[PDB]
Amino acid sequence: TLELLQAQAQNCTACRLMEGRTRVVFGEGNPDAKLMIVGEGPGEEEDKTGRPFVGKAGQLLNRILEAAGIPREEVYITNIVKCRPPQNRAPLPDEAKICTDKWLLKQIELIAPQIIVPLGAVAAEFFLGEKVSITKVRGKWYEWHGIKVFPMFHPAYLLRNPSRAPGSPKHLTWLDIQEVKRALDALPPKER
C-alpha cells in the first residue's frame, strides 16, 4: 500500500542524500489523485517538516493551485528525490535514478494519476525521457507510460524572477495552471 511504502521510505539509506537530511519527504495528498505534481527535491522547510512544498516556493505553489481552483488536498505532491540535497543543489543522476526506481515509480503505480505536472527541468527530464529546456517544454502536452504530462516552471524560478510583465515566468505559469485545470475537468473516469 501507499501508506506502507511511505513508512518504509522513512528508513531509506539507498543514496548519499541520506547523509545530510533531517527528515525524508515522501510526498502527500490524495492517494487516488487524478493530478500528481512532481518537483525536484526538498528545501529547508520540507527537510524540517517531512512535507513537500511548504517553504517559500511551496507557498507560491499553493497560491497557484488556489487561483486555478485546484484544492491542494485533492492532488498528490512529491519530488524526484525525497531527501534535501546539500544547500539545495539539484539531485545528481545516480540519486534521481535510485530514488525514482525505489519510490516514485511505485507511488505512480499505486496512485495511478491521469495527469502529471513536473515542476522544473529535473522533473521534466524524468518524464520526457531526455535532457530538456524547461522554458521550451513548459505549457505543452507530452505523454509518459500512457499518462498525460504537462511541464511547468518551478515555483522557485518564479521567486528568483518575479517580473509581473507580459510573458514573465509568473504570467506564463498562470496560463499553464489554467490549462491544467481545464484538462483535469475534461478527464474521463479512471480505469478500475
Ligand X SMILES: O=c1cc[nH]c(=O)[nH]1
* Residues binding ligand SF4 (CB under 6 A): 9, 12-15, 17-18, 24, 81-83, 95, 98-99, 102
Is 39 among the annotated ligand-binding positions? yes
Q: Which does 121 bind (CB under 5 to 8 A by kind): ligand SF4, ligand X, none?
A: none
Strand order in the sheet with 76-79: 28-29, 76-79, 35-39, 115-118, 147-149, 142-144
Q: Are 84 and 20 in contact (CB under 8 A)?
A: yes
For residue 188, the minimal CB distance to ligand X (Å) is 27
Q: Which does 67 bind (CB under 5 to 8 A by kind): ligand SF4, ligand X, none?
A: ligand X
Q: What are phi and psi of 64, to 5 degrees?
A: -60, -45
Q: Of residues 12, 26, 33, 52, which one binds ligand X by CB under 6 A?
A: 52
Q: Applying CB under 6 A, does 64 fall inside the site for ligand X? A: yes
Residue given cell 525521457 in the structure block: 129
Residues within window 65-94 making contact with ligand X, judged by CB under 6 A: 67, 79
Q: Are 33 and 74 in contact (CB under 8 A)?
A: yes
Question: Candidates 14-22, 49-57, 97-105, 136-144 — which segment interacts with ligand X by CB under 6 A?
Answer: 49-57
CA distance 52 to 39: 9
For residue 36, the minimal CB distance to ligand X (Å) is 13
For the stretch 123-133, what's the b/e string if a residue is b when 16 or more beta carbons lie within 10 angstroms of its beta carbon?
bbbbbbeeebe
Q: Applying CB under 6 A, does 151 fall inside the site for ligand X? A: no
Distances (CA, A) of 11 to 8, 22, 26, 32, 82: 6, 12, 11, 24, 11
CA distance 124 to 153: 10
Q: Which does 174 bind (CB under 5 to 8 A by kind): ligand X, ligand SF4, none?
A: ligand X
**Residue stretches of the annotated binding site for [4Fe-4S] cluster:** 12, 15, 83, 99
Per CB under 6 A, residues contacting ligand X are 39-43, 46, 52-53, 55, 57-58, 63-64, 67, 79, 156, 158, 170, 173-174
